[PDB]
Amino acid sequence: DVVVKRQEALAAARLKMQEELNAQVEKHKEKLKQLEEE
Amino acid sequence: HHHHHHQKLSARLRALRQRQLDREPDVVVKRQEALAAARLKMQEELNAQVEKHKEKLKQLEE
Amino acid sequence: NRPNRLIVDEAINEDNSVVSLSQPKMDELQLFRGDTVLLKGKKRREAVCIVLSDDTCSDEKIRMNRVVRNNLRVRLGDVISIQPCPDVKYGKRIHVLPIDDTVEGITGNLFEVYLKPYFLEAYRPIRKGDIFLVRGGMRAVEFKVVETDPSPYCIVAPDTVIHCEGEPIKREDEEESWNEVGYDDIGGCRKQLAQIKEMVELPLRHPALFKAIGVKPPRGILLYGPPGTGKTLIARAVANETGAFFFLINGPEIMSKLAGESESNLRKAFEEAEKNAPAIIFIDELDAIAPKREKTHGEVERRIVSQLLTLMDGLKQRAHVIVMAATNRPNSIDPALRRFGRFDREVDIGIPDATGRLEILQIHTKNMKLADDVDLEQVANETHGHVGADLAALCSEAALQAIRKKMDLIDLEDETIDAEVMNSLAVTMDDFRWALSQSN
Amino acid sequence: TAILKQKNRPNRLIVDEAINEDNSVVSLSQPKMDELQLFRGDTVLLKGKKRREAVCIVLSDDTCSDEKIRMNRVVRNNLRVRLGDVISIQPCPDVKYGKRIHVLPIDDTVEGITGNLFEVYLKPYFLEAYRPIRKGDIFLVRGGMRAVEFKVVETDPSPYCIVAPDTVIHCEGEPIKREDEEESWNEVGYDDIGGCRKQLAQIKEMVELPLRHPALFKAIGVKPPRGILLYGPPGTGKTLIARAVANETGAFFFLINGPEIMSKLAGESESNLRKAFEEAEKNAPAIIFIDELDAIAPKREKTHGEVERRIVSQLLTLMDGLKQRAHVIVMAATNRPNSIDPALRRFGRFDREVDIGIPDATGRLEILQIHTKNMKLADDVDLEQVANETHGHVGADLAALCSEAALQAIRKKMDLIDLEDETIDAEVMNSLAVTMDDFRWALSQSN
Ligand SMILES: Nc1ncnc2c1ncn2[C@@H]1O[C@H](COP(=O)(O)OP(=O)(O)NP(=O)(O)O)[C@@H](O)[C@H]1O
Ligand SMILES: Nc1ncnc2c1ncn2[C@@H]1O[C@H](COP(=O)(O)OP(=O)(O)NP(=O)(O)O)[C@@H](O)[C@H]1O
Ligand SMILES: [Mg+2]
């Protein structure tokens, strides 16, 4: 369980921040392209 | 003699004056018409350009 | 320019452990998504963070929210240094405290309502003396990291114990820490700072190297300039930046003391330095202690200078002590002091060029509410022969005009002033013109 | 303020290129001609920069704006104006048919004179055209494949005439040196002075205004100032301002150069001093200008000489010995104000003083701009920058900066050139430009 548990629970913890960033990134990219015509 | 010589000299001062200041209507008109007609010919050669340019403006803007 | 230096820029998300880079850069640097990184900023300050990947980030930039910048003491569009942190332990037990104004009625429920949610199952890294911010309920609260087992950095995992114990940290005591002067509050001197570092920090830091190529270091250094240039500042910075124990001798203060107490304090400082060594003794206002002996029609004054000479001289090379000093009236210092063994090397903290003037203005307006129409470069050009001081006080007078243009909206007899009107307050260009027209 | 500035009027018009390239042709808009009482092919007096006048044929053009006026290079050049200056137009109803007019051709547009110019160039051009011409017009004629430039030297009667079939056309003399015209082209007027509106304004109003309207002052019961003193450090533009005032002004202008007066023999100085004041009183309204006053009239304390003191007296006594009704102004100029004998700045004498000082960066710019207008400047050249990089610099300094820039630029090509060639590869000359680094290199020499 544990010495592996820490590492996977952590990697899986980062990869979840990564998602909630990527989530923003595209929302912003689309507001850039929405800006540059509008 | 010398009591006449100054009377004589004056007289022929007034003979060269009247000779030289004696010694129009048939050229007075010629000059003016030849001139007005000379200008009115420049006017043409300007107007000639003007339209050529006006049309190159309208040609430019389309 | 180097790989691991990057220009600072705002992050898109507001997460306190998140430092956004561009893929190319991470690859170049050998970094993987969600590694732990050591950011080093101004004033020796370091922060420890989670690096992540962001498309809209430039290759040469780096993204970070306020709360990180603040703890690197940097600002939008500084440069910072990033490197891997592969040592990072899971912390055992970490002491945190909240900051006195962010929390009123304070130490009730900050574990459960703020920290626990924030930290828990996140595996955030934190560093000793990071101040961070958490939102919980409608309030926001600021927490300093006091200590971390092990220090200075750790990863806060579910079983890391979280000590909410002590007295709430005073704003004042942390504002004091903001106002520390370091080499970044000094404008237009790279040339000289460079020299000072290599006459002073380098032979105190690597005394092996000089005995090794058979060379003696310089040991008396003298800063000179006209006044207002930045000498008194450069020392105050050297102090906060340097490796060594630093003793400061203030000239007029030594001379304020009684016949003999001066000579005492002089010795005391040299003894205290020899003792804590590697050391820098700094003497400000040298001219006031050690004038041209010709001019000083006094017994004691001459005794002091002797006393000084004999301490300068009375330093074994292996003492590991540097004496900096500083003056505006170089030629009025007793020529005995610039001999060999004594103040050997001299550094001109001169008048700055328009470039320098710019840096200076830029430093002095960083905490200032500047309008769009303000053209610092211009001001820099409109201010020939101006020194650090002059340019600072110009920025003052600008702001004291700007404030003067709102005295209709304000009352001198109110207790404190309408916040809206304060938040609204900006420094125009004409404020700068008005200032320029007063200081000529 | 310094308030002597151009006013809008009917007969002032903005200069713009003509459509056709006829040397006697000035195109206006009908409305304007009507407003002004002018008929197609009247003769007009155009007045331009530097007292220059040209006399021309006005004609009507539709595409011409009401506030503009059209004219081909050859007219603008002889008004000394440029595209988008203002000029003053008025009727010329005196215009005689000329009797006999002397013209000459210009040396470098005739290399290898085919010697037949009456027949090939001029006669066709002039003949049956009835062109007006003015003394010192330079005009251009195409005949054969060549083009040839002809100066009008004198016209009988002068200064303008109409050249009609029987007006005799003298092609006699020595071909006019390009030089001796490109000297008159490169003669100085107000526009070649940078960073002085303030002062120019003053000068105009202590000098030109009371010479031009002496009615007005006797009329509001006031006396004009009559001694004016320009002072500055050196390089600032004083000697220049006089050279311009001279070319621009109404009045007869006599110049007295200090060191030149003091070069002369015991008594000849005092003579020439008188001669000038006499000549002026005589052609008046007049401006006497004294350059380098400090060299004639120093503090009498310093000059351990008999004659030197006699001169100053002589001067004082001419200054004083001017009746108000003389209509003469004495300007003078110096860099060492405080060294001038204090007797001279009394009442009646040099009453008013004008500081031709050190210029601000704005001025420095105008100056640099003037000094580079004939110069082959690259894209990367930032005059504004240079202006800022040059504190405490004066006119002179900035000029010689622009010299040294160009002399660097020239130095960067010395590989492509030979000092031992007779003259130099045209391509490489046409190619030559002044970079910004030429200016930096300059700035780093003059500090
Ligand atoms: N190089 C600089 N960069 C930024 N600000 C400066 C600089 N130099 C001076 N100032 C400003 O003016 C203040 C006074 O300068 P200071 O540190 O006393 O220099 P100083 O030349 O030692 N003056 P003096 O004690 O008369 O010799 C500084 O604390 C700054 O507020
Ligand atoms: N205001 C200016 N505008 C443009 N060019 C200038 C100006 N002032 C000086 N210069 C340049 O510097 C040259 C020399 O200046 P000059 O007219 O002799 O001034 P000055 O002050 O009379 N010198 P001095 O005789 O020593 O008093 C001029 O020919 C110009 O080329
Ligand atoms: Mg001069």
Sign of the Cα pseudo-torsion (D362, D365, D371, D372, in order): negative
Taking the domains of chain D in order of start, what are their residue ranges?
A: 100-186, 190-355, 361-446
Residue of D106, D94, D73, D104 whose CA lies nearest to D159: D94
- Written as six digits, the tokens of D258 are 């200090």
What CA–CA distance (Å, rounded) separates D347 from D341? 14
- Taking the Cβ of residue A20 and every Cβ of chain C, the question of whether any pair is shorter than 8 Å is answered with yes
Q: Which of C37, C48, C42 is nearest to C127 (CA)?
A: C48
Distance from Cα C54 to the centre of ligand 2, integer Å: 61
Cβ within 8 Å of residue D107, ≥6 positions away: D175, D176, D177, D178
Neighbours of chain D (3+ CB pairs under 8 A): B, C
Specify the DSSP element, H or E, that contains C19.
strand C18-21
Report the C-alpha gap between D341 and D352 in whole angstroms.
15
Whether A35 has its CB under 8 Å from any CB of chain C: the answer is no
CA of D238, closest atom in ligand 2: 22
CA C35, C41, C47, C52: dihedral to nearest 10 degrees? -30
Q: Which pair of structure tokens corresponds to residue D67?
A: 């506030």
**Ligand 1 atom at shortest distance from the alpha carbon of C389:** 12
Q: Distance, CA C239 to ligand 1 centroid (Å)?
A: 15
Separation of alpha carbons D248 and D229, rounded Å: 19
Helices C354-364 and C388-404: angle between axes, nearest 10 degrees = 50
DSSP string, C233-282: HHHHHHHHH-SSEEEEEEHHHHHHS-TTHHHHHHHHHHHHHHHT-SEEEE
**DSSP class of residue D377?**
B
Q: How determined? A: X-ray
The enclosing H or E element of C348 equals strand C345-348
β-partners of residue D253 are D287
Touch criterion met for C and B (3+ Cβ pairs within 8 Å): no
Contacts of residue C133, defined as CB under 8 A and 6 or more positions apart, other chains included, come to C16, C67, C140, C141, C142, C143
Chains A and D touch (3+ CB pairs under 8 A): no
* Integer Cα distance of D402 and D384 in angstroms: 14
In sequence order, the β-bridge partners of residue D104 are: D151
Closest among D313, D312, D345 to D225, alpha carbons compared: D345
Backbone angles phi, psi at C160, to 5 degrees: -75, 120
Q: Which one of B30, B32, B45, B50 makes the best mutation probe of the D interface by having the most chain D beta carbons within 10 Å?
A: B50
Burial class (CB in 10 A: 0-12, 13-18, 19+), D26: buried
- Give CA separation, C282 vs A30, C87, C272, C322, in Å: 58, 38, 13, 8
Ligand index nearest the alpha carbon of residue C357? 1
Q: Look at the domain C352-440 and name its fold.
A: Helicase, Ruva Protein; domain 3 (1.10.8)
Write b or e for each residue in C328-353: b if 16 or more Cβ atoms lie within 10 A of its Cβ, otherwise e. bebeebbebbeeeebbbeebebbbbe
Cβ distance B38 to D128 less than 8 Å, yes or no, reads yes
Of the candidates C224, C348, C327, the one whose C-alpha atom is nearest the C-alpha of residue C285 is C327
The angle that helices C388-404 and C429-439 make with each other, rounded to 10 degrees, is 120
Residue D331 CB contacts under 8 Å (≥ 6 apart), including other chains: D203, D207, D228, D229, D230, D242, D245, D287, D288, D289, D290
Distance, in Å, from the CA atom of D114 to the CA atom of D151, rounded to the nearest integer, reads 18
Which structure tokens are listed for D371? 């000094």
Q: Is D235 annotated as a binding residue?
A: yes
Measured CA to CA, the distance from residue C376 to residue C358 in angstroms comes to: 7
Nearest ligand for residue D291 CA? 3
Residue C84 near residue C105 (C-beta atoms within 8 A): no
Maximum Cα–Cα distance for chain D, whole Å? 74
D150 φ/ψ angles, rounded to the nearest 5 degrees: -120, 120
Q: Which two tokens stand for residue D204?
A: 């105009």
What are the E-state strand segments in D245-381? 252-257, 286-291, 328-334, 352-355
Q: Which atom of ligand 1 is found nearest the CA of C181?
A: 29
One CATH from 3.30.830.10, 1.20.950.20, 3.10.330.10, 3.40.50.1820 for D100-186 = 3.10.330.10
Q: Which of A19, A35, A37, A27 is nearest to C56 (CA)?
A: A27
Give me D54's structure tokens.
Answer: 């040209």
D72 lines ligand 2 (CB under 6 A): no
Least CA distance to C355: which residue of chain D? D389
In angstroms, rounded to a whole number, what is the distance separating the alpha carbons of residues D21 and D125? 13
Torsions phi, psi of D92, nearest 5? -115, 80
**Sheet of strand D252-257, all strands in order from the earlier edge strand to the far edge:** D252-257, D286-291, D328-334, D227-231, D352-355
Considering the four listed CATH numbers 1.10.10.60, 3.40.50.300, 3.40.50.2000, 3.40.640.10, the one that applies to the domain covering C179-350 is: 3.40.50.300
Cβ pair D18, D71 in contact under 8 A: yes
Whether C219 and C322 have beta carbons less than 8 Å apart is answered as yes
Q: What are phi and psi of C364, to 5 degrees?
A: -70, -5
Strand bridging mode D43-47 / D53-60: antiparallel
Instruction: Decide the pairing of beta strands C220-224 and C321-327.
Output: parallel
What is the rounded CA–CA span in Å between residue C435 and residue D146?
65
Torsions phi, psi for D225 (to 5 deg) = -70, 150
Q: CB under 8 Å to C131, separation ≥6 — which residues?
A: C67, C70, C71, C99, C142, C143, C144, C145, C174
Give one DSSP letter per residue of C29-85, joined into a string: HT--TT-EEEEE-STT-EEEEEEEE-SSS-SSEEEE-HHHHHHHT--TT-EEEEEE-
Residue from D193, D197, D200, D239 to probe ligand 2 pocket by mutation (most atoms less than 8 Å from CB): D239
Q: What is the DSSP string of D87-150?
A: EEEEE-TT-PBPSEEEEEEBGGGGSS--S-HIIIIIHHHHTTT-EEEETT-EEEEE-SS-EEEE
Distance between CA atoms of residues D156 and D159, nearest Å: 8
CB contact under 8 A, B31 and D164: yes
Resolution for the entry shown, Å: 3.4
Q: Which CATH architecture has domain D361-446?
A: Orthogonal Bundle (1.10)
Residue C364 CB contacts under 8 Å (≥ 6 apart), including other chains: C391, C392, C395
Q: Enumerate the known binding-site residues of C for ATP.
A: 227-233, 328, 364
Residue with tokens 């260009």: C429
- Going by their DSSP bridges, the two strands D138-142 and D147-156 should be labelled as antiparallel
Closest by alpha carbon to C200, among C243, C249, C237? C243
Length of chain D measured in residues: 447
- Identify the CA nearest to D436 among candidates D363, D383, D361: D383
Judged by DSSP in three states, C413 sits in coil
Distance CA D306, CA B47 (A): 75
Are the beta carbons of C20 and A21 separated by less than 8 Å? yes
Closest CA to C233 of C396, C73, C388, C391: C388
Could you say which DSSP state residue C319 is in? G
User: ∠ at Cα C274 (C269, C278), nearest 5°?
Assistant: 110
How far apart are alpha carbons C13 and C281 in whole angstroms? Answer: 47
In whole angstroms, how far apart are CA D292 and each of D259, D289, D295, D336, D351? Answer: 7, 10, 6, 9, 17
Interface test mutation site (partner C, options D365, D382, D388, max chain C beta carbons within 10 A): D388
Contact by Cβ (8 Å): C266, C249: yes
Return the amino acid letter for C327. T
Amino acid at C100: D
**CB-CB contact of C50 with C21 (8 Å):** no
Distance CA D164, CA D99 (A): 8
Nearest by Cα to D137 from D32, D57, D229: D57
Residue in this structure with the two tokens 């350009």, named with its chain if needed:
B49
Query: Which residues lie with the beta carbon below 6 Å from any ligand 1 atom?
Result: C 186-189, 225, 227-233, 328, 360, 363, 388-389, 392
Q: What are phi and psi of D154, to 5 degrees?
A: -150, 155
| DSSP states of D187-214 | ---GGG--S-HHHHHHHIIIIIHHHH-H
CA–chain centroid gap for C297, Å, is 42
Residue D222, number of CB atoms within 10 A of its CB:
9
How many Å apart are CA C211 and CA C322, to the nearest integer?
16
CB neighbour list of residue D374: distance below 8 Å, 6 or more residues apart: none
Instruction: Give CA separation, D49 vs C185, D191, D205, in Å.
Output: 57, 9, 19
Chain C hits for D387, Cβ within 8 Å: none
- For residue D235 and ligand 2, the question of a CB distance below 6 A is answered with yes
CB pairs under 8 A between B and D: 47
Q: Determine the Cα–Cα distance for residues C194 and D175; give it in Å rounded to an integer.
A: 70
Mapping DSSP to helix (H, G, I), strand (E, B) and coil, where does residue D32 land?
Answer: helix
* Cα(D215)–Cα(D35) distance, integer angstroms: 30
CA proximity to D261, closest of D247, D275, D251 = D275
Structure tokens given for C369: 């509410």
Task: Give strand pairing partners of C153.
Answer: C127
- What totals of helices (H) and strands (E) does chain C contain, helices first? 18, 17
Residue D145 dihedral angles phi and psi, to the nearest 5°:
-75, -20
Cβ contact, residue pair D41, B50, below 8 Å: no
Question: Cα torsion for C44, C48, C50, C51, to the nearest 10°?
Answer: 30
C330 DSSP 8-state letter: G
- CA-based nearest residue in chain A for residue C156: A10
Report whether residue D370 contacts ligand 2, using a CB cutoff of 6 Å.
yes
Which residue of chain A has the CA closest to C158? A6
The length of chain C, given as a count of residues: 440
Rg (chain B; Cα; Å): 30
Would you say domain C1-87 falls under CATH 3.40.50.150?
Answer: no
Angstrom distance (rounded) from CA B47 to CA C408 = 67
Return the residue matching tokens 């009704």. Answer: D325
Token pair for residue D186?
A: 């490169």
Residue among D190, D199, D238, D240 to mutate when testing ligand 2 (max atoms within 8 A of CB)? D240
The answer to whether the CB of C13 falls within 8 A of the CB of C57 is no
- Measured CA to CA in angstroms, residue D34 lies from B42, C182, D49 at distances of 20, 78, 26
Chain A: list its partners (3+ Cβ pairs within 8 Å). Answer: C
Name the residues around ion ligand 3, CB cutoff 5 A. D 239
Contacts of C358 (CB under 8 A, 6+ apart): C187, C376, C377, C380
Residue nearest to atom 19 of ligand 2 (CA): D237
Burial C215-252 (b: 16+ CB within 10 A, else e): eebebbbbbbbeebbbbbbbbbbbbebbebbbbbbbbe
Does A13 contact chain C (CB < 8 Å)?
Answer: yes
**Per-residue b or e along D138-147, where b marks 16 or more CB atoms closer than 10 Å to that residue's CB:** bbbbebeeee
Neighbouring residues of B24: CB distance < 8 A, sequence distance ≥ 6: none
Token pair recorded at residue D92? 């010329």
Task: State the Cα angle at D422 between D417 and D425, rounded to 5°.
Answer: 40
Phi, psi of D46, deg, nearest 5: -95, 130
**Which residues from chain A sit within 8 angstroms of residue C33, using beta carbons?**
14-15, 18
What CATH fold (topology level) applies to the domain C89-165?
Vcp-like ATPase; Chain A, domain 2 (3.10.330)
Asked if domains C179-350 and C352-440 share a fold, the reply is no
Write out the binding residues of C.
227-233, 328, 364
Residue pair C410/C420 in contact (Cβ under 8 Å)? The answer is no
Q: Work out the minimum CA distance from D391 to partner chain C, whole angstroms.
A: 8
Q: Report the candidate in D164, D144, D163, D146 with the shortest Cα–Cα distance to residue D154.
A: D163
- Nearest CA to D46 among D137, D113, D153, D107? D137
φ, ψ of residue C104 to 5 degrees: the values are -115, 140
Close Cβ partners of D187 (under 8 Å, ≥ 6 residues apart): D50, D247
Q: Which pair of tokens denotes residue B27? A: 């050229």
Domain spanning D190-355: CATH superfamily:
P-loop containing nucleotide triphosphate hydrolases (3.40.50.300)
Q: How far apart are CA D445 and CA D364, in angstroms?
A: 18
**Alpha carbons C242 and C423: distance in angstroms, whole number:** 38
One-letter amino acid for residue C257 of the chain: K
Instruction: For residue A5, list chain C residues with Cβ-Cβ distance below 8 A.
Output: none
Residue D236 annotated as binding site: yes
Output b/e per residue, C147-180; b: 16+ Cβ within 10 A.
ebebeebbbbbeebebeeeeebbeeeeeeeeeeb
Contact D332, D352 (CB under 8 A): no
Distance from CA of B39 to the nearest CA of D (A): 5
Structure tokens at D267: 């008594």
Tell me if D239 CB under 6 Å of ligand 2.
Answer: yes
Q: For residue B43, give the nearest of D40, D129, D164 by CB distance.
A: D40
b (16+ CB within 10 A) / e for C294-324: eeeeeeebeebbebbbebbeebeeebbbbbb
Task: Please give the biggest Cα pair distance in chain A.
Answer: 54
B53 Cβ under 8 Å from any chain D Cβ: yes
Q: Whose CA is nearest to atom 5 of ligand 1?
A: C388
> What is the DSSP code string of B2-60?
HHHHHHHHHHHHHHHHHHHTT--HHHHHHHHHHHHHHHHHHHHHHHHHHHHHHHHHHHH
Structure tokens at C175: 């504002």
CA of residue C335 relative to chain centroid, distance: 34
The continuous run of DSSP H or E covering C299 comes out as helix C299-313
Euclidean distance between CA atoms D349 and D343, whole angstroms = 8
Q: What residue type is C175 in one-letter code?
A: E
